[PDB]
């Protein structure tokens, strides 16, 4: 564990029981040692770790993100003379850089130079950047067992796969694509307690991508007779891309040895099992092996359904035997990959919502409850309790449709957990006004918090108070991308609708790591907006954001400080668990911060990098709620 | 400071001294049925073993002082704590 010591001295005659400490003016104090520093004639002790932006002045009953930098005013005028009393200051970014942050990408610079991309830091010449995640540094400190705290998890997806800039590319977005090697986390595993690969699917799905469903179903049905195995209809689960999942070596932390990447949908099927599993999924098993080599086993998991593949949920509803066949494919998968700690489902619309391809009725929620119970029953019927699995679903926070989800019966039918999507509340391309797409906290004037100012706490309170659900059964997290909006006016939250907005790959969805590259910095031991891009924070909702005047472009985003706020709240609650959506594109600083928010403690005096200076707030402002502005 | 040089001038076996130093596994013991006052013991920072040797068993061999001499890791062979 980390450890530090200090000492104090007095005359041989005098022995204070308290830690005596030299009286001095406040000036950029820091660390763990006692400080009684003086300012404005008052005398101030932060009875907690000290940070270079924290100020005792405000600190008299503030000065840390949680409580009073308490004080007395014992200092006399001649003390205020012998020490030149401070009365104001401002911490600056230092000149040196205490730690490297990242490394450039040749190909991303080439990308910016591309005559279509034309990317620039200001985005003037190019609204998108398609920056390679390879730019990133490892950025994970190390931490104690800390068994009591709620579990930590992260989501993971296929976009880890490819950036043909590694392959030259140069002409199309995927050639300028994104992806990373899990080797990153592997270097220092147990970074989380659980993981969730992105929602996969089943035969018969309806959305745009369904040609993939067709293809894989074809490969399956062709293989099945040759394997001497029964054919499958709709509702049977799909792996989406076994070639990615297994027919891989790059990005999957394992030597190209045995990487028969040639194998594919028409051929993978014998290999469709953990023992044989090459590539990504196999590597994951190996990751867990290293993890256990230490101990503290990860909850390896994934789920199915989700934003873009939920379409068949209604269709499968009220088709009980096909639902049976579906869960049969579920348990079959379990048999094929008993490695898994659990897997879950990603139904998203008991009442219709999201993409319209998700056809839906009212009864959907009821039928969904029913089938869910039936799933639980099947699950219990297969599993041995010594190895039992317990299931979760996300939730949308749609004040009403969440009710329509009938969580009560889900709980009564052994659905153990819920993960609240805590992000993208700001439907930036269509939303009426700019707002924080991920605000946990209620701003003032809740009079309009129905399609706006959607403090998740409201739903939280519904479940706890208005639904009695124990916090244990509910989980929350954060995501590693902000929103971006054109022409927004900070006074009105009015903004340029439809106008194209910043993203490396996804307009309107600025990508955290590249923001670290472009707009924000910390190299000088601080939270540091850079390149003329405004760092800013609102007192109304504890909101945190970024701006640029030349295009009136705004970004709403979580921050180290802000995820700190979140995790600290959740911890104070003692929620069921904590996680991060889209974990694929943070260096890990937000995870280290997440440990801090969980109160999860580091295990050594050494660091991968510091984190304290990342919690100074941005440009303070008060933003009126939508209701406040309209009123 | 070298254990063997010492023992040789001593004309006596090093183990005798090691036992003098109680440095073997024969660690001191104390009854459960007594609690010593001023118990600055057992803290996560009370790393010293208790009872201490400079507090029990051979105290006189030290100035009733924390830095009791003991075996220390070999360098040019096994070694004595300090002068």
């Amino acid at each position: 564990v980390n450890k530090y010591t200090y000492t104090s001295s007095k005359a041989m005659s005098d022995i204070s029981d308290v830690i005596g400490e030299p009286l001095a003016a406040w000036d950029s104090q820091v660390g763990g040692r006692v400080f009684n520093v003086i300012f404005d004639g008052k005398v101030y002790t932060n009875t907690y770790w000290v940070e270079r932006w924290q100020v005792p002045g405000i600190g008299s009953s503030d000065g840390n993100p949680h409580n009073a930098w308490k004080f007395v005013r014992a200092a006399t005028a001649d003390e205020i003379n012998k020490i030149g009393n401070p009365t104001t200051a401002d911490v600056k970014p230092t000149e040196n850089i205490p730690s490297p942050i990242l490394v450039e990408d040749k190909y991303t610079e080439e990308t910016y130079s591309r005559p279509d991309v034309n990317f620039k830091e200001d985005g003037s010449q190019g609204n998108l950047s398609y920056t390679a995640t390879r730019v990133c540094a490892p950025m994970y400190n190390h931490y104690v067992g800390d068994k009591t705290k709620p579990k930590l998890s992260a989501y993971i997806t296929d976009w880890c796969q490819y950036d043909a800039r590694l392959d030259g590319g140069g002409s199309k977005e995927e050639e300028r694509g994104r992806g990373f090697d899990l080797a990153t986390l592997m270097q220092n595993p147990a970074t989380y307690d659980r993981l969730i690969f992105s929602f996969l699917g089943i035969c018969g799905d309806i959305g745009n991508k369904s040609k993939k469903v067709q293809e894989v179903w074809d490969g399956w049905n062709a293989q099945a007779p040759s394997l001497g195995l029964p054919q499958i209809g709709k509702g049977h689960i799909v792996p989406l891309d076994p070639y990615g999942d297994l027919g891989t070596a790059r990005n999957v932390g394992l030597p190209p040895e045995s990487a028969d990447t040639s194998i594919e949908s028409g051929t993978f099927l014998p290999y469709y099992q953990q023992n044989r599993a090459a590539g990504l999924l196999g590597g994951l098993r190996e990751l867990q092996k290293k993890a256990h080599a230490m101990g503290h086993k990860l909850d390896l998991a994934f789920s199915i359904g989700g934003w873009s593949l939920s379409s068949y949920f209604s269709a499968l509803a009220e088709n009980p035997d096909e639902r049976r066949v579906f869960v049969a494919s579920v348990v079959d998968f379990f048999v094929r990959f008993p490695m898994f700690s659990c897997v879950d489902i990603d139904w998203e619309y008991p009442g219709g919502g999201g993409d319209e391809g998700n056809i839906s009725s009212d009864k959907d929620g009821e039928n969904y409850v029913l089938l869910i119970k039936e799933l639980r029953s099947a699950l219990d019927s297969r599993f041995g309790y010594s190895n039992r699995k317990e299931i979760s679903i996300a939730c949308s926070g749609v004040k009403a449709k969440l009710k329509k989800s009938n969580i009560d019966q889900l709980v009564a039918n052994g659905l153990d957990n819920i993960y609240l999507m805590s992000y993208d509340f700001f439907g930036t391309i269509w939303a009426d006004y700019i707002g924080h797409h991920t605000n946990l906290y209620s701003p003032k004037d809740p009079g309009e918090q129905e399609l706006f100012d959607l403090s998740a706490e409201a739903a939280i309170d519904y479940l706890h108070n208005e639904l009695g659900i124990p916090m244990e059964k509910i989980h929350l997290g954060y995501a590693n991308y902000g929103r971006s909006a054109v022409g927004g006016d900070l006074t009105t939250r009015q903004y340029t609708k439809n106008g194209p907005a910043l993203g490396t790959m996804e307009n309107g969805a600025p990508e955290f790591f590249d923001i670290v590259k472009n707009y924000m910095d910390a190299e000088h031991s601080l939270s540091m907006g850079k390149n003329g891009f405004v760092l800013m924070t609102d007192t109304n909702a504890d909101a945190d954001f970024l701006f640029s005047e030349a295009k009136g472009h705004f970004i709403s985003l979580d921050t180290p400080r802000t995820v700190k706020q979140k995790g600290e709240y959740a911890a104070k609650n003692k929620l069921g668990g904590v996680f991060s959506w889209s974990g694929d594109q943070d260096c890990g600083l937000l995870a280290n911060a997440a440990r801090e928010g969980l109160g999860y403690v580091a295990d050594s005096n050494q660091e991968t990098i510091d984190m304290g200076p990342l919690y100074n707030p941005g440009k303070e402002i008060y933003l009126k709620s939508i209701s406040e502005i309209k009123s | 400071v070298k254990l063997v040089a010492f023992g040789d001038q001593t004309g006596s076996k090093a183990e005798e001294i090691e036992s003098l130093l109680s440095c073997g596994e024969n660690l001191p013991i104390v009854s459960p049925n007594v609690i010593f006052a001023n118990p600055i013991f057992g803290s996560y920072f009370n790393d010293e073993p208790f009872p201490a040797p400079y507090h029990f068993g051979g105290v006189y061999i030290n100035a009733h002082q924390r830095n009791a001499m003991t075996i220390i890791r070999a360098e040019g062979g096994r070694e004595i704590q300090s002068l």
């Binding site: 092996k289 290293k290 256990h292 080599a293 | 070999a74 062979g77 096994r78």
Partner: peptide, 27 residues
């Protein structure tokens, strides 16, 4: 000279599984 080392001490023999995921090739 009869130069002598210490005991073939126990250290702590540890009951734990055997795999290169447990045993170590170092490489």
């Amino acid at each position: 000279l009869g130069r002598r080392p210490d005991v073939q001490l126990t250290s702590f023999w540890q009951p734990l599984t055997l795999e290169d995921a447990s045993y170590k090739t170092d490489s």
